[PDB]
């Protein structure tokens, strides 16, 4: 097909989901160790006493 000289310029670009928030959860301080560890730490406490 034929084209005119361009009427608008552009280039390929990247669109992004700009913001994120991610405010931490309340009980977030229990995340370095997994649930499975935190539950096995109460079974060991009950079994050592």
Partner 1 sequence: ILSVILLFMGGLCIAASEFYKTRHNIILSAGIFFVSAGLSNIIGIIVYISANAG
Which residues 1-49 are close enough to bind partner 1 by CB under 8 A?
Answer: 21, 23, 26, 36, 40, 43-44, 46-47
d(CA 43, CA 35): 13
Residue in the structure block whose two tokens are 């997994």: 34
Provide the minimum distance between the beta carbon of 19 and partner 1 in the complex, in angstroms, as a whole number. 13
Nearer to partner 1, 2 or 36 (CB): 36
Provide the minimum distance between the beta carbon of 43 and partner 1 in the complex, in angstroms, as a whole number. 5
- The answer to whether 38 and 30 are in contact (CB under 8 A) is yes
């Amino acid at each position: 097909i034929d084209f005119s000289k361009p009427f608008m310029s552009l280039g390929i670009s990247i669109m992004i989901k700009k913001p994120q928030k991610s405010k931490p959860g309340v009980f977030s301080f229990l995340d370095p160790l997994a649930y499975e560890i935190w539950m096995c730490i109460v079974f060991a406490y009950i079994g050592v006493s």
